Amino acid sequence: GTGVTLFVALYDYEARTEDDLSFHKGEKFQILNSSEGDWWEARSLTTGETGYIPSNYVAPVDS
């Protein structure tokens, strides 16, 4: 890749507040904030949208 840390979705997720992101298994993200708890703010690569995601639904792309 280009050097930025990326995470991948392990499962589909449907958003539960206006500030959450919906995503498919296999989606890639840049993580923007992982400091305020277990909901992380992320940017989706295929959509470009930003929002919270549940951190248990993602894993680093490296492996």
Binding site: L10, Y11, D12, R16, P54, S55, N56, Y57
Partner: peptide, 8 residues
């Protein structure tokens, strides 16, 4: 609230 569990 914590993250929800992975889907069924």
């Amino acid at each position: 609230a914590p993250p929800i569990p992975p889907p069924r």
